[PDB]
Paper text:
Of the four members of the BET family proteins, BRD4 is the most thoroughly characterized, and its aberrant activity has been associated with NUT midline carcinoma, colon, breast and prostate cancers, neuroblastoma, and hematopoietic cancers. BRD4 overexpression has been shown to promote tumor growth by stimulating transcription of major oncogenic drivers, such as MYC.
Importantly, SRX3212 retained its high inhibitory activity for PI3Kα as measured by a kinase screening assay. In all complexes, the thienopyranone moiety inserts deeply in the binding pocket laying parallel to the α-helices of BRD4BD1, whereas the benzodioxane moiety of SRX3212, SRX3212P and SF2523P is oriented toward the ZA loop of BRD4BD1. The carbonyl oxygen in the thienopyranone moiety of all compounds forms a hydrogen bond with the amide nitrogen of Asn140 and a water-mediated hydrogen bond with the hydroxyl group of Tyr97 of BRD4BD1. While the nitrogen atom in the piperazine ring of SRX3212P and SF2523P is unrestrained, the oxygen atom in the morpholine ring of SRX3212 is involved in a water mediated polar interaction with the carboxyl group of Asp144, which likely accounts for a sevenfold increase in potency of SRX3212 compared to SRX3212P. Although the hydrogen bond between the side chain amide of Gln85 and the dioxane moiety of the thienopyranone scaffold is conserved, restraining SRX3212, SRX3212P and SF2523P, the presence of the pyrid-3-ylmethylaminocarbonyl benzodioxane moiety in SRX3212 and SRX3212P altered the hydrophobic contacts with Trp81. The indole ring of Trp81 flips over ~ 180° in SRX3212 and SRX3212P compared to this ring’s position in SF2523P, enhancing its interaction with the benzodioxane moiety. The short 3.5 Å distance between the pyridyl moiety of SRX3212 and the methyl group of Leu92 suggested an additional methyl-π contact that might explain the enhancement in potency of SRX3212. We have developed and characterized one of the most potent BRD4 inhibitor to date, SRX3212, with an IC50 of 3.7 nM for BRD4BD1.
Author numbering: 44 to 170
C-alpha cells in the first residue's frame, strides 16, 4: 500500500469559510451516515482486498476519511477544493470498475445524495 493523501502541510496557510464549515458539519455527516458509505470511509486497502493493480490505475486516490481530516486541518482553501475531492473519489470508483457493477452503483447512490446536499451550502462565501 502507498501512503494516503496527506491532510496538512505546514507551508500551506489555514483558511476556513462558511461553506467549508457547513461541508464538514452537515454534508459529510449525512454522507458518512448513508447506507453505502462504509467502502469510502477510509483509503482503499488494495492488499487485503486483493486489488494489486488498484494504485497503478488510480493515480489520485481519495476517500471521505482523508476528506474529513482535510476539512478539520483546514487543508482546503475554499469549498470548491473540497467538492473536487468527492468528484475524484467517485470517478476513481468509476475508472477502476466497469459500468453497472455493485460498487459503482453504491458510489452512484452516494454521489446523488452528495450533489443534493451541497446545493444547501451558502451561495455566498464568508471567511
Ligand atoms: O469489497 C469490499 N467489501 C466486501 C469484502 C468481501 C470479501 C473480502 N473483503 C471485503 C470493500 C470494498 C471497498 C472499495 C471502496 S472503492 C472500491 C473499488 O473501486 C473497487 C473494489 N473492488 C472491486 C471488485 O469488487 C470487490 C472490490 O472495492 C472498493 C472498501 C471496503 C470494502 O470492505 C472493507 C472495507 O472497505
Amino acid at each position: 500500500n502507498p501512503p494516503p493523501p496527506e491532510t496538512s502541510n505546514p507551508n500551506k496557510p489555514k483558511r476556513q469559510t462558511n461553506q467549508l464549515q457547513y461541508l464538514l458539519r452537515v454534508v459529510l455527516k449525512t454522507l458518512w451516515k448513508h447506507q453505502f458509505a462504509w467502502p469510502f470511509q477510509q483509503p482503499v486497502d488494495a492488499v487485503k482486498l486483493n486489488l494489486p493493480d488498484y494504485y497503478k490505475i488510480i493515480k489520485t486516490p481519495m476517500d471521505m476519511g482523508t476528506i474529513k481530516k482535510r476539512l478539520e486541518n483546514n487543508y482546503y482553501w475554499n469549498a470548491q477544493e473540497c467538492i473536487q475531492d468527492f468528484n475524484t473519489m467517485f470517478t476513481n470508483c468509476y475508472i477502476y470498475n466497469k459500468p453497472g457493477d455493485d460498487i459503482v452503483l453504491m458510489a452512484e447512490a452516494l454521489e446523488k445524495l452528495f450533489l443534493q446536499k451541497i446545493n444547501e451550502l451558502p451561495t455566498e462565501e464568508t471567511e
